[PDB]
Design a protein around this nucleic acid. Structure first.
Lengths: 97, 813
DNA sequence: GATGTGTAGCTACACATC
DNA sequence: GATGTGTAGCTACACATC
């Protein structure tokens, strides 16, 4: 048998490969020029202005992360691991039937 | 004209034209050195340094990637470098250029850096970027510097590493990488704690990669960014070449290759496959055997995956493999594995030519297979030898399982090898498993396979009883018989009545095994018991209750195996084993599922309880909502957010269940309303409470959860589109159920979270008429009899409007 | 063989803007 | 938060040159 079951088996795996964490990780000209001769140089001081109100720094919350941005351990939950029985991997049940 | 003004015109001319193209960069470099040389002879050295700086200040405010900046930056870098170069080749032998050009450079580079460091903390993001950009490119060519300026650079950089913008943080490490031989410490911190993947990458590739830093670099093999996981294999492991087998430890090494070969992304796998096949093979001179000594085969598990990809990459070397004739005297774990790998490969893809002459005959392999059994078990680094022999025996046996046995002499020969192998009382489990697998392949029919196995089982049983002739085999013997029986029963696939010997065996020890006092023996007894229950239905019913008590009072190991049995009994027999005369009531079993699922102390047991329940609900053997509701709660609940195995299981099972059949989705919609409520209370309770350990962020926010339930219930995601499933109202009825619940929540923010995401709905003209009317009557009721939040008011007003227009559409005959 | 150069297409992740 | 345009890496193939 398994015309319908192999049909759907194939669909889900390919479609749900980026949803495996499944935890809030489920997607679903001008050629302007500069005239170096002109003396608009009082803008030079605009480049060196102090920060003042602008934060231009990272909040300390984000400067350290415990996850380290590593993937979680992958148990590779695929349609195959679900179809096969527990104590009898050879045999499988006909869910999607 | 003044000399100072002349200098300005000359340098300004260069920059004005250099900005246009890379065409005359060489000339410009030569011009500048000429302008500089003429300025220092006239005493105006400082005049050159002054103007030059002002013009590099003109380009800083330009954005990143602004075409003009790059050109000027490249020029300034080439100018510094060209000056340094003039200064090195002299020092190599010729000295001392009597025009003080070493001091002029040290005086110029020191003065230049201090100028661009006046915009290191500017508010403008572009100024900060290009200041760091100038430093990275000129960093290598600074030569020597005063000590103070050295402290001022590391001081400014160790602050800019934590800058707001990721871009400037990338340029920061580029400037720090040139200091590695304290800088290392900072980069190790940024490769781990930086949110921008491109900063982690930059810190990864340009890191020192000595003995101490290497682990953090190889850590990125599991970086959440796909690119950062691909380049570690491509860039870093190609840069090391053979240094991997020498400097990297095997236990870390075996893990890397493992992650790469089975990563979820197609891109990362190719980066690892190609690395092994193309680069390492060429790096190892084509020695397929030596490559298998690197990828340890005795203690690894993915060599099967690596050898396949290799054969796919190099089908030419495939034909030149020779298993030289009858020289199997020296058969290394690499060769023995090679044998299994190549043989099973040709069978899978029907490499017809090889299967004829490149492999020994059935009977001729039995000579070599047995040759290692006597050498291992019969007659007397000893354990190294023991393990290697079992390994070889294992590889040949796995290949022997799938041999052509049209030849009868070969079949009967091998058969006599496994039968005298399985009869061994010191056979390790890996060999017991495959031995049965081979003997299953030899048997002509099932009854045969059973009889032979049973005989070996009883002989080992009786050999100990008659030796004591208290009539019960030693606890050890009981283990060996039971493990042998399970592997057999795993292969038997017909009722017990047709095989009388199974029942006799089961009556002897499978039952006393259950009643034993040893854990391991008990677990095995349940294992075999379950395998028999899948064959006889009445046997399952008679044993439904007994299993339920081991899942309630049994230790973790027994509780673990016992539950699996119950799940499979249901998979094959359905509800025939419960709810009936002499059959256990399903309510008791649902209560046992509850207990296991709830129990926080044993995670793995939660997993099989979760994984099992989904399989049953999938086959429609389970259809209880109050249980299905408790099933979804355990997914988001903060108490189960710490079990990694448990989350992924539900990630895969819940979508497939909802999208498999309309009825399964309908069930989600009917109950998903109450679900969101219970979680909203849990989030609120979790947020408000103050208890030394909290991690209130250990759970999803109700807005995300709401979108989640709208996704699953979305009728657009049904795999089988009947064409008339677009009039399904499942999501509407869900939302209607939530609106009636909207009055039970009490916190503004939560209510906003629900309302803000209500417009992910799917509304169509073919959908029923009265259901939209109902949803509209509830929506407007909430909109105009409650104080809303401007955000929530517009989004809600919008939803209302979607209907109204819709009602005209349908209202027209 | 091994290597460039040439165009084209692609996906995740940046930024920009409002 | 939600956006549109960007952009970083490829990937792939046709080649032309050495």
């Amino acid at each position: 048998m398994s015309i319908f079951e192999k049909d759907l088996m194939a669909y889900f795996d390919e479609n749900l490969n980026r949803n495996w964490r499944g935890r809030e990780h489920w997607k679903v000209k001008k050629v302007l020029e500069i005239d170096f001769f002109k003396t608009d140089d009082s803008f030079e001081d605009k480049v060196f202005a102090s920060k003042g109100r602008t934060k231009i720094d990272m909040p300390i919350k984000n400067r350290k992360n415990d996850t380290h941005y590593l993937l979680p351990d992958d148990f590779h939950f695929s349609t195959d691991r679900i179809t096969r029985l527990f104590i009898k991997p050879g045999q499988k049940m006909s869910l999607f039937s | 004209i003044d000399i100072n003004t002349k200098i300005f015109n000359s340098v300004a001319e260069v920059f004005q034209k250099a900005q246009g193209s890379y065409a005359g960069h060489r000339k410009h470099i030569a011009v500048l050195k000429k302008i500089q040389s003429k300025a220092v002879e006239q005493g105006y050295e400082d005049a050159f340094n002054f103007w030059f700086d002002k013009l590099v200040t003109k380009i800083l405010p330009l954005k990143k990637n602004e075409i003009i900046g790059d050109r000027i930056v490249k020029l300034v870098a080439a100018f510094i470098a060209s000056l340094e170069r003039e200064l090195i080749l002299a020092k190599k032998q010729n000295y001392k250029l009597t025009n003080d050009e070493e001091g002029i450079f040290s005086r110029f580079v020191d003065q230049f850096i201090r100028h661009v460091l006046r915009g290191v903390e500017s508010p403008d993001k572009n100024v900060r970027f290009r200041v760091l950009q100038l430093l990275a490119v000129i960093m290598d060519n600074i030569g020597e510097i005063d000590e103070s300026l050295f402290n001022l650079l590391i001081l400014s950089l160790n602050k800019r590493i934590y800058d707001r913008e990721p871009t400037v943080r990338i340029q920061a490490v580029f400037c720090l990488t040139k200091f590695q031989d304290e800088a290392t410490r900072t980069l190790v911190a940024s490769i781990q704690n930086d949110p921008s993947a491109e900063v982690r990458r930059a810190a990864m590739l340009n890191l020192i990669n000595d003995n101490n830093t290497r682990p953090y670099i190889l850590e990125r093999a599991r970086d959440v960014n796909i690119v950062n996981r691909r380049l570690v294999y491509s860039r870093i492991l190609k840069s090391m070449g053979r240094k991997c087998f020498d400097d990297i430890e095997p236990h870390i090494f075996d893990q890397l290759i493992e992650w790469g070969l089975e990563d979820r992304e197609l891109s990362v796998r190719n980066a690892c496959k190609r690395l092994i096949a193309h680069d390492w093979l060429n790096a190892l001179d084509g020695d397929l055997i030596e490559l298998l000594e690197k990828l340890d085969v005795s203690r690894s598990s993915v060599c099967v995956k690596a050898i396949e990809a290799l054969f796919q990459s190099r089908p030419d070397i495939l034909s030149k493999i020779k298993f030289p004739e009858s020289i199997w005297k020296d058969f290394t774990v690499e060769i023995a594995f090679l044998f299994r790998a190549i043989y099973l490969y040709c069978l899978d893809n029907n490499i017809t030519e090889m299967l004829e002459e490149n492999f020994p005959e059935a009977s001729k392999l039995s000579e070599h297979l047995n040759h290692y059994i006597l050498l291992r078990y019969h007659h007397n680094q000893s354990h190294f030898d023991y393990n290697t022999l079992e390994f070889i025996i294992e590889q040949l046996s796995i290949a022997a399982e799938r041999y052509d046995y049209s030849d009868e002499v070969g079949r009967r020969s091998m058969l006599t090898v496994v039968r005298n192998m399985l009869a061994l009382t010191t056979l390790s489990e890996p060999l017991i498993k495959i031995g049965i697998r081979v003997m299953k392949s030899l048997s002509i029919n099932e009854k045969d396979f059973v009889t032979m196995a049973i005989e070996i089982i009883n002989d080992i049983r009786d050999d100990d009883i008659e030796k004591q002739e208290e009539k019960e085999a030693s606890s050890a013997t009981i283990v060996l018989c039971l493990t042998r029986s399970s592997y057999m029963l795993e292969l038997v696939n017909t009722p017990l009545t047709e095989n009388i010997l199974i029942a006799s065996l089961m009556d002897t020890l499978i039952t006393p095994a259950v009643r034993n006092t040893a854990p391991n023996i008990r677990e095995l007894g349940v294992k075999n018991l379950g395998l028999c229950c899948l064959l006889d239905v009445k046997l399952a019913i008679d044993n439904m209750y007994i299993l339920g008590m081991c899942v309630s009072k049994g230790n973790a190991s027994l509780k673990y195996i016992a539950l699996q049995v119950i799940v499979d009994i249901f998979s094959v027999h359905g509800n025939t084993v419960v709810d009936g005369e002499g059959k256990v009531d399903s309510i008791s079993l649902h209560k046992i599922f509850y207990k296991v699922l709830k129990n926080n102390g044993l995670p793995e047991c939660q997993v099989i309880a979760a994984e099992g329940l989904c399989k049953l609900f999938l086959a429609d053997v389970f259809t209880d909502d109050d249980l299905f509701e408790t099933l979804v709660l355990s997914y988001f609940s903060p108490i189960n957010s710490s079990n990694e195995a448990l989350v992924q299981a539900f990630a895969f099972c819940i979508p497939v269940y909802c999208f498999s059949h309309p009825a399964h989705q309908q069930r989600m919609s009917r109950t998903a309303a109450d679900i969101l409520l219970r979680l909203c209370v849990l989030w609120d309770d979790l947020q408000s409470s103050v208890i030394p350990e909290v991690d209130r962020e250990a759970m999803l926010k109700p807005n995300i959860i709401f979108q989640q339930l709208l996704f699953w219930t979305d009728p657009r995601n049904l795999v089988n589109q009947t064409g008339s499933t677009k009039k399904d109202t499942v999501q509407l009825t869900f939302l209607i159920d939530v609106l009636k619940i909207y009055a039970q929540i009490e916190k503004k923010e939560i209510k906003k979270m629900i309302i803000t995401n209500i417009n992910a709905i799917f509304l169509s003209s073919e959908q029923d008429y009265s259901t939209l009317k109902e949803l509209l009557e509830y929506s407007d009721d909430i909109a105009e009899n409650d104080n809303l939040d401007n955000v929530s008011k517009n989004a809600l007003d919008k939803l209302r409007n979607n209907l109204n227009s819709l009602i005209e559409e349908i209202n027209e005959r």
